[PDB]
Design a protein around this ligand. Structure first.
Ligand SMILES: O=C1CN(S(=O)(=O)c2cc3ccc(Cl)cc3s2)CCN1Cc1cc2cnccc2n1CCO
Ligand SMILES: [Ca+2]
Lengths: 53, 234
């Protein structure tokens, strides 16, 4: 259990292993947070989210 | 959808419904963006003229969040074969953009490698639609959803009387009475990861519905991501 195989590498979404290191990324409509792990919605009604209002 | 549950308010916002000239749904779809719907290529053989309805949950009354959209261009995979259902994927571009609101939002398209290793290795996925509630049953007037476990590729190939190509995958139950059915085709198969849902399949086919020893067969979306991306730019 190493890198992206260890709990998705702590990434919210996409995980890529580069040079024996974890690199996180997000779906269109999202932007990677300052911690390079979390994914922040760019606007209203981001993909993959159930609507609450 | 056989078994399963009703999609509650705001639960299945990416569901689209292909309707014919007589206003009856005949296939499903997934909202990919404001201009694009993902569906099954074999559905484009179910009507000479059709439109797309989004935001619907009960075809028997109007909640007010529904919106009908006309199709501007139909993009069918050139390699689609009716005899076996191989390459069962199509993309639709709408004449007018979809205004996202309650019960109307797009599902996320994932990246191939990450999806196949992390999404598709999850226990379950979710399939939904207005299709039949029983094999010989009538279409549902309510949008339904059902959690379908991923099925071992070998066990599935063994169970099927027909060819399972590299462009398909299986999900469902061996004996349990839960599965997609007629009318759900073209509809969404999605997987949830940390409260975000990603497109992982397109309701394609099965031998009957919920039959013992038979599974539901879906188009392997992860195998067409580059194709989908190109279609959404033409
Ligand atoms: O028995 C059914 C059921 N319908 S259905 O519209 O009721 C569906 C049932 C079902 C069940 C699960 C999922 Cl995921 C999708 C669907 S579509 C599809 C076609 N068939 C027959 C069928 C499947 C199939 C697969 N490959 C080649 C030829 C095939 N035929 C025609 C010969 O019987
Ligand atoms: Ca309605």
């Amino acid at each position: 259990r190493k890198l992206c195989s260890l709990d998705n590498g702590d990434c919210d979404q996409f995980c890529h292993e580069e040079q024996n290191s974890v690199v996180c990324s997000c779906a269109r409509g999202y932007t990677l947070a300052d911690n390079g792990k979390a994914c922040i919605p760019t606007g209203p009604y981001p993909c993959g989210k159930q609507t609450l209002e | 959808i056989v078994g399963g549950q009703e999609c509650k308010d705001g639960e299945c916002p990416w569901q689209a419904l292909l309707i014919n000239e007589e206003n009856e749904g005949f296939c499903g779809g997934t909202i990919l963006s404001e201009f694009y719907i993902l569906t099954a290529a074999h559905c484009l053989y179910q009507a000479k003229r059709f439109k797309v309805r989004v935001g619907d949950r009960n075809t028997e009354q109007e909640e007010g969040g529904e919106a009908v959209h006309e199709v501007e261009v139909v993009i069918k995979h050139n390699r689609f074969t009716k005899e076996t259902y191989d390459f069962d994927i199509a993309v639709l571009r709408l004449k007018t953009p979809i205004t996202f609101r309650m019960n109307v939002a797009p599902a996320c398209l994932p990246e191939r490698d990450w999806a196949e290793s992390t999404l598709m290795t999850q226990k379950t996925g979710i399939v939904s639609g207005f299709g039949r509630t029983h094999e010989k049953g009538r279409q549902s007037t309510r949008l339904k959803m059902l959690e379908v476990p991923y099925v071992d590729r070998n066990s599935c190939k063994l169970s099927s009387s027909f060819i399972i190509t590299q462009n398909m995958f299986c999900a469902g139950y061996d004996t349990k009475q839960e599965d997609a059915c007629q009318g759900d085709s073209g509809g969404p198969h999605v997987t949830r990861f940390k409260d975000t849902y990603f497109v992982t399949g397109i309701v394609s086919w099965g031998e009957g519905c919920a039959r013992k020893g038979k599974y539901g067969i879906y188009t392997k979306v992860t195998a067409f991501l580059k194709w989908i991306d190109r279609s959404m730019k033409t």
